[PDB]
Amino acid sequence: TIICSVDIGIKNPAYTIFRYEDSKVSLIAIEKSDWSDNWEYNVTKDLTKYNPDIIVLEKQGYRSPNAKIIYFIKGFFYNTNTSVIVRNPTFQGGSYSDRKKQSVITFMDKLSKLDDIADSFNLGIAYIES
Amino acid sequence: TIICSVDIGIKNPAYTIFRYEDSKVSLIAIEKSDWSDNWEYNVTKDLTKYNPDIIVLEKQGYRSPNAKIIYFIKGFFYNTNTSVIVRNPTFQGGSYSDRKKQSVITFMDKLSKLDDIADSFNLGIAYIES
Ligand SMILES: [Mg+2]
Ligand SMILES: [Mg+2]
């Protein structure tokens, strides 16, 4: 099963591709992108590039400029082999920059503008552990 | 070509189906629905029911929680033989009451609570003037 956990953003989107076979997780790819222009074309292209079995997203809120993107993805993959799972922020508390720092920290510690890739990565891990 | 102009709503979604052959428009159906529960399920079921070639919707306004339905539809019909057009409100200006009232009135004359079906009706007609 191929997991595509993405950290939704307009100009700063990012997603990490994992492979989960036999309780053995493996980082297949990591990529930054740009959905500031022609988001619809790029959103489908980027998320279908690796044919994920599961796409993980973070809850956005109707007042967010990212909300349109989360609902497009749900509709696009609705009734297909890919299942879209939406979660809550991996990190919560302190200030905005506080969560963005421990996210990047946790990220580089696990490998062995980074906050977008860090988030996407950490989001997949938080999901996989379930 | 089958055109499905929809008047998005949670409890009062309505949509009219127009056939358009030889520069001759004709009513095929007019339906009220309910998207209070499992809107994803009902939205897809209702809009594909009459196999439209085009879906016409109207902008829901900045930071509107019902925009989720608009993007879900764009994403669902993305890259299929179904075009999704989003138009601006058909009746603008004045009070909400007058806009609904002008829709119902206008809808009653051309046809030869009713604001949802009329709104959806007038939306299709407006799109056709294109
Ligand atoms: Mg980000
Ligand atoms: Mg209505």
Side-chain angles (χ1 to χ4, degrees), chain A residues 41-86:
Chain A
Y41 168 71
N42 289 321
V43 162
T44 60
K45 181 181 183 168
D46 292 347
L47 303 185
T48 56
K49 183 177 177 182
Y50 294 90
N51 326 307
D53 296 304
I54 294 180
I55 282 173
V56 192
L57 313 173
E58 191 175 308
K59 181 65 188 298
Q60 294 301 312
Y62 72 98
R63 312 173 80 85
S64 181
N66 300 322
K68 66 171 174 190
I69 293 182
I70 181 181
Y71 285 104
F72 178 84
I73 295 169
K74 301 173 83 84
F76 183 90
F77 291 100
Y78 185 77
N79 190 53
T80 68
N81 298 314
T82 312
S83 98
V84 179
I85 283 72
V86 185

mmCIF file of all heavy atoms in Angstrom, chain A residues 41-86:
data_model
loop_
_atom_site.group_PDB
_atom_site.id
_atom_site.type_symbol
_atom_site.label_atom_id
_atom_site.label_comp_id
_atom_site.label_asym_id
_atom_site.label_seq_id
_atom_site.Cartn_x
_atom_site.Cartn_y
_atom_site.Cartn_z
ATOM 1 N N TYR A 41 -5.135 21.468 -12.236
ATOM 2 C CA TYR A 41 -4.320 20.611 -13.101
ATOM 3 C C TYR A 41 -3.145 20.017 -12.331
ATOM 4 O O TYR A 41 -2.834 18.828 -12.454
ATOM 5 C CB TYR A 41 -3.778 21.413 -14.293
ATOM 6 C CG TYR A 41 -2.692 20.702 -15.082
ATOM 7 C CD1 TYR A 41 -2.979 19.589 -15.881
ATOM 8 C CD2 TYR A 41 -1.368 21.127 -15.005
ATOM 9 C CE1 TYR A 41 -1.965 18.916 -16.588
ATOM 10 C CE2 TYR A 41 -0.346 20.465 -15.699
ATOM 11 C CZ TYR A 41 -0.647 19.364 -16.487
ATOM 12 O OH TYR A 41 0.383 18.727 -17.158
ATOM 13 N N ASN A 42 -2.492 20.861 -11.539
ATOM 14 C CA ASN A 42 -1.343 20.445 -10.758
ATOM 15 C C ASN A 42 -1.692 19.562 -9.580
ATOM 16 O O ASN A 42 -0.941 18.647 -9.244
ATOM 17 C CB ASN A 42 -0.591 21.677 -10.288
ATOM 18 C CG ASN A 42 0.123 22.359 -11.420
ATOM 19 O OD1 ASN A 42 0.679 21.716 -12.309
ATOM 20 N ND2 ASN A 42 0.109 23.679 -11.397
ATOM 21 N N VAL A 43 -2.832 19.834 -8.951
ATOM 22 C CA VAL A 43 -3.271 19.031 -7.817
ATOM 23 C C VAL A 43 -3.512 17.583 -8.237
ATOM 24 O O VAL A 43 -3.073 16.667 -7.552
ATOM 25 C CB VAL A 43 -4.548 19.622 -7.177
ATOM 26 C CG1 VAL A 43 -5.242 18.594 -6.305
ATOM 27 C CG2 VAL A 43 -4.172 20.823 -6.348
ATOM 28 N N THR A 44 -4.181 17.370 -9.367
ATOM 29 C CA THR A 44 -4.464 16.007 -9.813
ATOM 30 C C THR A 44 -3.184 15.295 -10.269
ATOM 31 O O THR A 44 -2.927 14.148 -9.893
ATOM 32 C CB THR A 44 -5.530 15.997 -10.950
ATOM 33 O OG1 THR A 44 -5.058 16.756 -12.067
ATOM 34 C CG2 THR A 44 -6.833 16.619 -10.463
ATOM 35 N N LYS A 45 -2.385 16.002 -11.066
ATOM 36 C CA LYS A 45 -1.113 15.510 -11.588
ATOM 37 C C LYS A 45 -0.160 15.113 -10.442
ATOM 38 O O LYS A 45 0.362 13.990 -10.411
ATOM 39 C CB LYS A 45 -0.499 16.610 -12.462
ATOM 40 C CG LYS A 45 0.840 16.311 -13.133
ATOM 41 C CD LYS A 45 1.286 17.549 -13.937
ATOM 42 C CE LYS A 45 2.588 17.338 -14.707
ATOM 43 N NZ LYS A 45 2.817 18.445 -15.691
ATOM 44 N N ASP A 46 0.058 16.024 -9.498
ATOM 45 C CA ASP A 46 0.934 15.746 -8.365
ATOM 46 C C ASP A 46 0.496 14.550 -7.510
ATOM 47 O O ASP A 46 1.311 13.681 -7.191
ATOM 48 C CB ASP A 46 1.048 16.977 -7.462
ATOM 49 C CG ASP A 46 1.800 18.116 -8.119
ATOM 50 O OD1 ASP A 46 2.436 17.877 -9.168
ATOM 51 O OD2 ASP A 46 1.767 19.248 -7.584
ATOM 52 N N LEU A 47 -0.788 14.508 -7.148
ATOM 53 C CA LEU A 47 -1.324 13.442 -6.303
ATOM 54 C C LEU A 47 -1.538 12.095 -6.982
ATOM 55 O O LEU A 47 -1.651 11.073 -6.313
ATOM 56 C CB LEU A 47 -2.625 13.900 -5.644
ATOM 57 C CG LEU A 47 -2.564 15.172 -4.786
ATOM 58 C CD1 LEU A 47 -3.917 15.376 -4.136
ATOM 59 C CD2 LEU A 47 -1.486 15.073 -3.723
ATOM 60 N N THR A 48 -1.592 12.079 -8.306
ATOM 61 C CA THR A 48 -1.771 10.820 -9.035
ATOM 62 C C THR A 48 -0.429 10.274 -9.564
ATOM 63 O O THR A 48 -0.340 9.128 -10.006
ATOM 64 C CB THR A 48 -2.757 11.005 -10.218
ATOM 65 O OG1 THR A 48 -2.294 12.052 -11.081
ATOM 66 C CG2 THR A 48 -4.147 11.358 -9.699
ATOM 67 N N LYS A 49 0.612 11.100 -9.496
ATOM 68 C CA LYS A 49 1.939 10.722 -9.969
ATOM 69 C C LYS A 49 2.420 9.380 -9.431
ATOM 70 O O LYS A 49 3.008 8.594 -10.168
ATOM 71 C CB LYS A 49 2.944 11.819 -9.608
ATOM 72 C CG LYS A 49 4.352 11.580 -10.107
ATOM 73 C CD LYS A 49 5.258 12.758 -9.773
ATOM 74 C CE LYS A 49 6.708 12.500 -10.194
ATOM 75 N NZ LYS A 49 7.578 13.650 -9.810
ATOM 76 N N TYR A 50 2.154 9.112 -8.155
ATOM 77 C CA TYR A 50 2.574 7.866 -7.508
ATOM 78 C C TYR A 50 1.458 6.858 -7.249
ATOM 79 O O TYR A 50 1.679 5.858 -6.560
ATOM 80 C CB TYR A 50 3.257 8.189 -6.182
ATOM 81 C CG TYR A 50 4.547 8.943 -6.359
ATOM 82 C CD1 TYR A 50 4.562 10.339 -6.388
ATOM 83 C CD2 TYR A 50 5.752 8.264 -6.551
ATOM 84 C CE1 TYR A 50 5.749 11.043 -6.608
ATOM 85 C CE2 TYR A 50 6.943 8.955 -6.769
ATOM 86 C CZ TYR A 50 6.936 10.342 -6.797
ATOM 87 O OH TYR A 50 8.108 11.020 -7.014
ATOM 88 N N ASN A 51 0.268 7.126 -7.787
ATOM 89 C CA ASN A 51 -0.900 6.257 -7.609
ATOM 90 C C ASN A 51 -1.073 5.771 -6.177
ATOM 91 O O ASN A 51 -1.048 4.566 -5.916
ATOM 92 C CB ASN A 51 -0.802 5.038 -8.513
ATOM 93 C CG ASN A 51 -0.124 5.348 -9.811
ATOM 94 O OD1 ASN A 51 -0.515 6.284 -10.523
ATOM 95 N ND2 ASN A 51 0.909 4.570 -10.137
ATOM 96 N N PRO A 52 -1.253 6.695 -5.227
ATOM 97 C CA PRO A 52 -1.424 6.263 -3.838
ATOM 98 C C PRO A 52 -2.708 5.446 -3.589
ATOM 99 O O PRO A 52 -3.701 5.578 -4.318
ATOM 100 C CB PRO A 52 -1.406 7.585 -3.077
ATOM 101 C CG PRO A 52 -1.977 8.567 -4.090
ATOM 102 C CD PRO A 52 -1.254 8.165 -5.331
ATOM 103 N N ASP A 53 -2.674 4.589 -2.569
ATOM 104 C CA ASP A 53 -3.840 3.790 -2.214
ATOM 105 C C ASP A 53 -4.589 4.619 -1.197
ATOM 106 O O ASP A 53 -5.810 4.504 -1.032
ATOM 107 C CB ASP A 53 -3.429 2.464 -1.576
ATOM 108 C CG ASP A 53 -2.656 1.581 -2.523
ATOM 109 O OD1 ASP A 53 -3.171 1.284 -3.622
ATOM 110 O OD2 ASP A 53 -1.528 1.187 -2.169
ATOM 111 N N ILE A 54 -3.824 5.463 -0.517
ATOM 112 C CA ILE A 54 -4.357 6.336 0.500
ATOM 113 C C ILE A 54 -3.723 7.718 0.418
ATOM 114 O O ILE A 54 -2.522 7.853 0.195
ATOM 115 C CB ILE A 54 -4.113 5.744 1.898
ATOM 116 C CG1 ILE A 54 -4.932 4.461 2.047
ATOM 117 C CG2 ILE A 54 -4.479 6.757 2.976
ATOM 118 C CD1 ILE A 54 -4.777 3.763 3.385
ATOM 119 N N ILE A 55 -4.550 8.745 0.569
ATOM 120 C CA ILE A 55 -4.071 10.117 0.561
ATOM 121 C C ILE A 55 -4.458 10.690 1.914
ATOM 122 O O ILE A 55 -5.620 10.625 2.318
ATOM 123 C CB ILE A 55 -4.709 10.941 -0.596
ATOM 124 C CG1 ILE A 55 -4.008 10.594 -1.913
ATOM 125 C CG2 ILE A 55 -4.582 12.429 -0.327
ATOM 126 C CD1 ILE A 55 -4.646 11.195 -3.134
ATOM 127 N N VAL A 56 -3.474 11.214 2.635
ATOM 128 C CA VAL A 56 -3.750 11.787 3.943
ATOM 129 C C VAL A 56 -3.675 13.307 3.844
ATOM 130 O O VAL A 56 -2.744 13.849 3.246
ATOM 131 C CB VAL A 56 -2.753 11.273 5.014
ATOM 132 C CG1 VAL A 56 -3.244 11.663 6.398
ATOM 133 C CG2 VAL A 56 -2.602 9.755 4.901
ATOM 134 N N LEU A 57 -4.682 13.980 4.403
ATOM 135 C CA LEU A 57 -4.764 15.436 4.388
ATOM 136 C C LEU A 57 -5.073 15.923 5.800
ATOM 137 O O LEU A 57 -5.506 15.152 6.651
ATOM 138 C CB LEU A 57 -5.880 15.907 3.438
ATOM 139 C CG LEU A 57 -5.976 15.307 2.026
ATOM 140 C CD1 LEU A 57 -7.248 15.786 1.343
ATOM 141 C CD2 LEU A 57 -4.756 15.695 1.215
ATOM 142 N N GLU A 58 -4.851 17.206 6.043
ATOM 143 C CA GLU A 58 -5.127 17.798 7.344
ATOM 144 C C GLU A 58 -6.394 18.673 7.260
ATOM 145 O O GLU A 58 -6.590 19.385 6.276
ATOM 146 C CB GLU A 58 -3.923 18.638 7.765
ATOM 147 C CG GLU A 58 -3.953 19.110 9.201
ATOM 148 C CD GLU A 58 -2.669 19.829 9.598
ATOM 149 O OE1 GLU A 58 -1.575 19.248 9.371
ATOM 150 O OE2 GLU A 58 -2.761 20.966 10.135
ATOM 151 N N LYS A 59 -7.253 18.614 8.278
ATOM 152 C CA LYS A 59 -8.481 19.416 8.292
ATOM 153 C C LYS A 59 -8.158 20.910 8.089
ATOM 154 O O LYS A 59 -7.296 21.463 8.771
ATOM 155 C CB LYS A 59 -9.229 19.203 9.613
ATOM 156 C CG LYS A 59 -10.538 19.979 9.733
ATOM 157 C CD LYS A 59 -11.578 19.505 8.718
ATOM 158 C CE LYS A 59 -12.817 20.411 8.701
ATOM 159 N NZ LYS A 59 -13.537 20.421 10.008
ATOM 160 N N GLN A 60 -8.864 21.556 7.158
ATOM 161 C CA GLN A 60 -8.627 22.969 6.821
ATOM 162 C C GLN A 60 -9.555 24.076 7.387
ATOM 163 O O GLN A 60 -9.071 25.129 7.810
ATOM 164 C CB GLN A 60 -8.562 23.118 5.294
ATOM 165 C CG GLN A 60 -7.378 22.423 4.630
ATOM 166 C CD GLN A 60 -6.011 22.914 5.130
ATOM 167 O OE1 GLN A 60 -5.754 24.115 5.224
ATOM 168 N NE2 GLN A 60 -5.126 21.972 5.432
ATOM 169 N N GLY A 61 -10.870 23.861 7.389
ATOM 170 C CA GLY A 61 -11.759 24.897 7.895
ATOM 171 C C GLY A 61 -12.262 25.710 6.715
ATOM 172 O O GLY A 61 -11.471 26.129 5.867
ATOM 173 N N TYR A 62 -13.565 25.961 6.656
ATOM 174 C CA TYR A 62 -14.127 26.679 5.517
ATOM 175 C C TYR A 62 -13.576 28.073 5.234
ATOM 176 O O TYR A 62 -13.696 28.560 4.103
ATOM 177 C CB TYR A 62 -15.663 26.737 5.620
ATOM 178 C CG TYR A 62 -16.178 27.655 6.689
ATOM 179 C CD1 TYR A 62 -16.590 28.948 6.369
ATOM 180 C CD2 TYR A 62 -16.209 27.265 8.036
ATOM 181 C CE1 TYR A 62 -17.012 29.828 7.351
ATOM 182 C CE2 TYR A 62 -16.635 28.148 9.028
ATOM 183 C CZ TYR A 62 -17.033 29.429 8.667
ATOM 184 O OH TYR A 62 -17.454 30.333 9.607
ATOM 185 N N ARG A 63 -12.964 28.709 6.234
ATOM 186 C CA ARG A 63 -12.415 30.061 6.065
ATOM 187 C C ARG A 63 -10.989 30.073 5.514
ATOM 188 O O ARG A 63 -10.393 31.134 5.344
ATOM 189 C CB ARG A 63 -12.432 30.807 7.401
ATOM 190 C CG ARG A 63 -13.749 30.711 8.142
ATOM 191 C CD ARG A 63 -13.652 31.321 9.534
ATOM 192 N NE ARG A 63 -13.743 32.782 9.529
ATOM 193 C CZ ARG A 63 -14.889 33.464 9.544
ATOM 194 N NH1 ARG A 63 -16.054 32.827 9.563
ATOM 195 N NH2 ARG A 63 -14.863 34.790 9.560
ATOM 196 N N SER A 64 -10.453 28.890 5.237
ATOM 197 C CA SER A 64 -9.092 28.745 4.741
ATOM 198 C C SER A 64 -8.982 28.717 3.223
ATOM 199 O O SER A 64 -9.818 28.137 2.537
ATOM 200 C CB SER A 64 -8.488 27.455 5.297
ATOM 201 O OG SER A 64 -7.155 27.298 4.855
ATOM 202 N N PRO A 65 -7.937 29.345 2.673
ATOM 203 C CA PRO A 65 -7.776 29.341 1.220
ATOM 204 C C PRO A 65 -7.435 27.940 0.702
ATOM 205 O O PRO A 65 -7.400 27.697 -0.510
ATOM 206 C CB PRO A 65 -6.649 30.353 1.002
ATOM 207 C CG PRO A 65 -5.861 30.253 2.259
ATOM 208 C CD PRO A 65 -6.941 30.223 3.305
ATOM 209 N N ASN A 66 -7.188 27.025 1.640
ATOM 210 C CA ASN A 66 -6.853 25.640 1.319
ATOM 211 C C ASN A 66 -8.089 24.755 1.329
ATOM 212 O O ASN A 66 -8.020 23.607 0.903
ATOM 213 C CB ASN A 66 -5.861 25.051 2.327
ATOM 214 C CG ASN A 66 -4.552 25.813 2.388
ATOM 215 O OD1 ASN A 66 -4.031 26.276 1.369
ATOM 216 N ND2 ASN A 66 -4.001 25.929 3.591
ATOM 217 N N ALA A 67 -9.211 25.269 1.826
ATOM 218 C CA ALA A 67 -10.437 24.479 1.878
ATOM 219 C C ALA A 67 -10.890 24.010 0.484
ATOM 220 O O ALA A 67 -11.290 22.863 0.307
ATOM 221 C CB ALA A 67 -11.546 25.282 2.558
ATOM 222 N N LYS A 68 -10.821 24.892 -0.511
ATOM 223 C CA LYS A 68 -11.237 24.520 -1.862
ATOM 224 C C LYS A 68 -10.446 23.309 -2.363
ATOM 225 O O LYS A 68 -10.973 22.472 -3.079
ATOM 226 C CB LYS A 68 -11.050 25.700 -2.823
ATOM 227 C CG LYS A 68 -9.617 26.075 -3.034
ATOM 228 C CD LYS A 68 -9.461 27.087 -4.132
ATOM 229 C CE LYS A 68 -8.005 27.546 -4.204
ATOM 230 N NZ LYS A 68 -7.822 28.727 -5.104
ATOM 231 N N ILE A 69 -9.180 23.226 -1.972
ATOM 232 C CA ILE A 69 -8.303 22.137 -2.375
ATOM 233 C C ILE A 69 -8.631 20.806 -1.710
ATOM 234 O O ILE A 69 -8.572 19.752 -2.344
ATOM 235 C CB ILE A 69 -6.821 22.520 -2.109
ATOM 236 C CG1 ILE A 69 -6.433 23.669 -3.041
ATOM 237 C CG2 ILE A 69 -5.895 21.332 -2.346
ATOM 238 C CD1 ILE A 69 -5.003 24.109 -2.928
ATOM 239 N N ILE A 70 -8.987 20.833 -0.435
ATOM 240 C CA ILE A 70 -9.310 19.589 0.237
ATOM 241 C C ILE A 70 -10.603 18.992 -0.325
ATOM 242 O O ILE A 70 -10.695 17.783 -0.510
ATOM 243 C CB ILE A 70 -9.382 19.770 1.783
ATOM 244 C CG1 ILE A 70 -9.691 18.430 2.441
ATOM 245 C CG2 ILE A 70 -10.428 20.790 2.163
ATOM 246 C CD1 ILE A 70 -9.798 18.500 3.944
ATOM 247 N N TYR A 71 -11.588 19.824 -0.647
ATOM 248 C CA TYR A 71 -12.835 19.296 -1.200
ATOM 249 C C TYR A 71 -12.735 18.861 -2.658
ATOM 250 O O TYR A 71 -13.504 18.007 -3.121
ATOM 251 C CB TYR A 71 -13.961 20.301 -0.994
ATOM 252 C CG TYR A 71 -14.391 20.289 0.443
ATOM 253 C CD1 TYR A 71 -14.016 21.318 1.316
ATOM 254 C CD2 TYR A 71 -15.044 19.177 0.974
ATOM 255 C CE1 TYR A 71 -14.268 21.234 2.681
ATOM 256 C CE2 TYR A 71 -15.301 19.076 2.339
ATOM 257 C CZ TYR A 71 -14.908 20.107 3.186
ATOM 258 O OH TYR A 71 -15.145 19.996 4.542
ATOM 259 N N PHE A 72 -11.782 19.435 -3.381
ATOM 260 C CA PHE A 72 -11.569 19.052 -4.764
ATOM 261 C C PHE A 72 -10.990 17.642 -4.746
ATOM 262 O O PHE A 72 -11.413 16.776 -5.514
ATOM 263 C CB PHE A 72 -10.579 20.004 -5.433
ATOM 264 C CG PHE A 72 -10.263 19.650 -6.853
ATOM 265 C CD1 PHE A 72 -11.087 20.066 -7.884
ATOM 266 C CD2 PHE A 72 -9.142 18.880 -7.155
ATOM 267 C CE1 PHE A 72 -10.799 19.715 -9.208
ATOM 268 C CE2 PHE A 72 -8.844 18.527 -8.464
ATOM 269 C CZ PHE A 72 -9.676 18.945 -9.494
ATOM 270 N N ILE A 73 -10.028 17.418 -3.853
ATOM 271 C CA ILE A 73 -9.379 16.115 -3.717
ATOM 272 C C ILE A 73 -10.371 15.025 -3.283
ATOM 273 O O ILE A 73 -10.320 13.897 -3.799
ATOM 274 C CB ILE A 73 -8.185 16.200 -2.725
ATOM 275 C CG1 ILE A 73 -7.109 17.127 -3.312
ATOM 276 C CG2 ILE A 73 -7.608 14.809 -2.449
ATOM 277 C CD1 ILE A 73 -6.004 17.513 -2.355
ATOM 278 N N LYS A 74 -11.272 15.346 -2.353
ATOM 279 C CA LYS A 74 -12.285 14.378 -1.916
ATOM 280 C C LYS A 74 -13.183 13.987 -3.103
ATOM 281 O O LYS A 74 -13.493 12.807 -3.304
ATOM 282 C CB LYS A 74 -13.171 14.969 -0.821
ATOM 283 C CG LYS A 74 -12.443 15.407 0.419
ATOM 284 C CD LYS A 74 -13.411 16.130 1.345
ATOM 285 C CE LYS A 74 -14.224 15.161 2.204
ATOM 286 N NZ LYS A 74 -13.501 14.729 3.459
ATOM 287 N N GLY A 75 -13.596 14.992 -3.878
ATOM 288 C CA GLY A 75 -14.445 14.757 -5.036
ATOM 289 C C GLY A 75 -13.741 14.017 -6.154
ATOM 290 O O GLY A 75 -14.307 13.105 -6.776
ATOM 291 N N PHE A 76 -12.494 14.399 -6.413
ATOM 292 C CA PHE A 76 -11.725 13.756 -7.474
ATOM 293 C C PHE A 76 -11.502 12.270 -7.220
ATOM 294 O O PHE A 76 -11.629 11.461 -8.131
ATOM 295 C CB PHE A 76 -10.379 14.457 -7.654
ATOM 296 C CG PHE A 76 -9.565 13.904 -8.781
ATOM 297 C CD1 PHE A 76 -9.694 14.430 -10.077
ATOM 298 C CD2 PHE A 76 -8.729 12.807 -8.586
ATOM 299 C CE1 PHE A 76 -9.003 13.863 -11.173
ATOM 300 C CE2 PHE A 76 -8.038 12.237 -9.671
ATOM 301 C CZ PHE A 76 -8.181 12.772 -10.971
ATOM 302 N N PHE A 77 -11.173 11.915 -5.976
ATOM 303 C CA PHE A 77 -10.911 10.523 -5.604
ATOM 304 C C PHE A 77 -12.109 9.812 -5.017
ATOM 305 O O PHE A 77 -12.005 8.668 -4.579
ATOM 306 C CB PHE A 77 -9.748 10.462 -4.619
ATOM 307 C CG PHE A 77 -8.431 10.815 -5.235
ATOM 308 C CD1 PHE A 77 -7.892 12.083 -5.074
ATOM 309 C CD2 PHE A 77 -7.749 9.888 -6.017
ATOM 310 C CE1 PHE A 77 -6.693 12.421 -5.684
ATOM 311 C CE2 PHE A 77 -6.548 10.217 -6.632
ATOM 312 C CZ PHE A 77 -6.019 11.481 -6.468
ATOM 313 N N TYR A 78 -13.254 10.488 -5.007
ATOM 314 C CA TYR A 78 -14.456 9.880 -4.474
ATOM 315 C C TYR A 78 -14.825 8.722 -5.381
ATOM 316 O O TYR A 78 -14.758 8.832 -6.611
ATOM 317 C CB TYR A 78 -15.603 10.889 -4.415
ATOM 318 C CG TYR A 78 -16.853 10.346 -3.749
ATOM 319 C CD1 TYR A 78 -16.943 10.235 -2.352
ATOM 320 C CD2 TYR A 78 -17.959 9.954 -4.514
ATOM 321 C CE1 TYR A 78 -18.109 9.753 -1.739
ATOM 322 C CE2 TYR A 78 -19.121 9.472 -3.911
ATOM 323 C CZ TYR A 78 -19.189 9.377 -2.530
ATOM 324 O OH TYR A 78 -20.346 8.922 -1.954
ATOM 325 N N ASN A 79 -15.179 7.599 -4.768
ATOM 326 C CA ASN A 79 -15.577 6.418 -5.526
ATOM 327 C C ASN A 79 -14.499 5.888 -6.494
ATOM 328 O O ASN A 79 -14.785 5.599 -7.649
ATOM 329 C CB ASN A 79 -16.871 6.730 -6.287
ATOM 330 C CG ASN A 79 -17.489 5.508 -6.906
ATOM 331 O OD1 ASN A 79 -17.720 4.507 -6.229
ATOM 332 N ND2 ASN A 79 -17.767 5.577 -8.203
ATOM 333 N N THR A 80 -13.260 5.783 -6.018
ATOM 334 C CA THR A 80 -12.150 5.256 -6.811
ATOM 335 C C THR A 80 -11.400 4.315 -5.875
ATOM 336 O O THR A 80 -11.875 4.037 -4.769
ATOM 337 C CB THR A 80 -11.170 6.361 -7.303
ATOM 338 O OG1 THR A 80 -10.463 6.916 -6.191
ATOM 339 C CG2 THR A 80 -11.916 7.460 -8.026
ATOM 340 N N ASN A 81 -10.238 3.829 -6.304
ATOM 341 C CA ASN A 81 -9.438 2.918 -5.482
ATOM 342 C C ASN A 81 -8.648 3.653 -4.402
ATOM 343 O O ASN A 81 -8.198 3.051 -3.421
ATOM 344 C CB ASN A 81 -8.482 2.110 -6.364
ATOM 345 C CG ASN A 81 -9.219 1.240 -7.376
ATOM 346 O OD1 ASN A 81 -10.190 0.548 -7.028
ATOM 347 N ND2 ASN A 81 -8.762 1.263 -8.635
ATOM 348 N N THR A 82 -8.490 4.962 -4.585
ATOM 349 C CA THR A 82 -7.761 5.797 -3.640
ATOM 350 C C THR A 82 -8.711 6.331 -2.581
ATOM 351 O O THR A 82 -9.794 6.809 -2.885
ATOM 352 C CB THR A 82 -7.111 6.977 -4.359
ATOM 353 O OG1 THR A 82 -6.431 6.499 -5.530
ATOM 354 C CG2 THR A 82 -6.130 7.689 -3.426
ATOM 355 N N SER A 83 -8.313 6.238 -1.326
ATOM 356 C CA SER A 83 -9.172 6.718 -0.262
ATOM 357 C C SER A 83 -8.525 7.930 0.412
ATOM 358 O O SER A 83 -7.341 7.914 0.762
ATOM 359 C CB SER A 83 -9.436 5.596 0.752
ATOM 360 O OG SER A 83 -8.569 5.701 1.867
ATOM 361 N N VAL A 84 -9.313 8.988 0.572
ATOM 362 C CA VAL A 84 -8.835 10.215 1.175
ATOM 363 C C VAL A 84 -9.203 10.266 2.644
ATOM 364 O O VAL A 84 -10.377 10.223 2.999
ATOM 365 C CB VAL A 84 -9.433 11.451 0.454
ATOM 366 C CG1 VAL A 84 -8.937 12.729 1.100
ATOM 367 C CG2 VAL A 84 -9.051 11.425 -1.019
ATOM 368 N N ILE A 85 -8.184 10.331 3.495
ATOM 369 C CA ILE A 85 -8.391 10.417 4.931
ATOM 370 C C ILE A 85 -7.952 11.802 5.375
ATOM 371 O O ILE A 85 -6.852 12.242 5.047
ATOM 372 C CB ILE A 85 -7.561 9.356 5.719
ATOM 373 C CG1 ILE A 85 -8.220 7.986 5.611
ATOM 374 C CG2 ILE A 85 -7.452 9.755 7.196
ATOM 375 C CD1 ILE A 85 -8.108 7.353 4.264
ATOM 376 N N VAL A 86 -8.816 12.488 6.115
ATOM 377 C CA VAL A 86 -8.514 13.825 6.610
ATOM 378 C C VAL A 86 -8.278 13.743 8.124
ATOM 379 O O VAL A 86 -9.046 13.100 8.840
ATOM 380 C CB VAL A 86 -9.685 14.793 6.299
ATOM 381 C CG1 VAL A 86 -9.324 16.204 6.699
ATOM 382 C CG2 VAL A 86 -10.011 14.750 4.821
#
